[PDB]
Amino acid sequence: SMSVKKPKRDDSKDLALCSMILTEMETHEDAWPFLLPVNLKLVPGYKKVIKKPMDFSTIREKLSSGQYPNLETFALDVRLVFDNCETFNEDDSDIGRAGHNMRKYFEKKWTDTFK
Numbered sequence: 001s002m003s004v005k006k007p008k009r010d011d012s013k014d015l016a017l018c019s020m021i022l023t024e025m026e027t028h029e030d031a032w033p034f035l036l037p038v039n040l041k042l043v044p045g046y047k048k049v050i051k052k053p054m055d056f057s058t059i060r061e062k063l064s065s066g067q068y069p070n071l072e073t074f075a076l077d078v079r080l081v082f083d084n085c086e087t088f089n090e091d092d093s094d095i096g097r098a099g100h101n102m103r104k105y106f107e108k109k110w111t112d113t114f115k
């Protein structure tokens with residue numbers, strides 16, 4: 001509360017670390033469904049069903065231009081990529097399995113890096 005400060009977690013390396021995690025996700029072989037925004041004009045249903053589209057290139061642009069206030073907002077966009085993937089694809093499709101694999105990959109990097 002006012003004039004009563006909790007001890008400050010060091011956040012100075014957060015930007016660099018999130019960038020490294022994103023690089024590792026960008027270069028994963030199962031990243032291909034997520035590298036670019038879904039083509040809303042070539043994919044039936046996507047625009048109406050998925051209210052907040054997200055993809056790795058959009059996360060990268062946001063990270064490079066100061067649009068994440070903190071590391072949790074970055075993690076929210078990453079998870080949104082995989083949540084959107086689950087909403088729209090069957091678990092036993094290639095894209096569906098790719099999403100599950102990438103989420104697992106991310107969350108371990110997240111835990112190892114920050115937790």
Ligand SMILES: Clc1ncnc2[nH]cnc12
Binds near residue numbers: 043085095
């Ligand atoms: Cl690139 C692409 N095409 C169709 N559905 C998708 N879900 C996630 N990425 C997708």
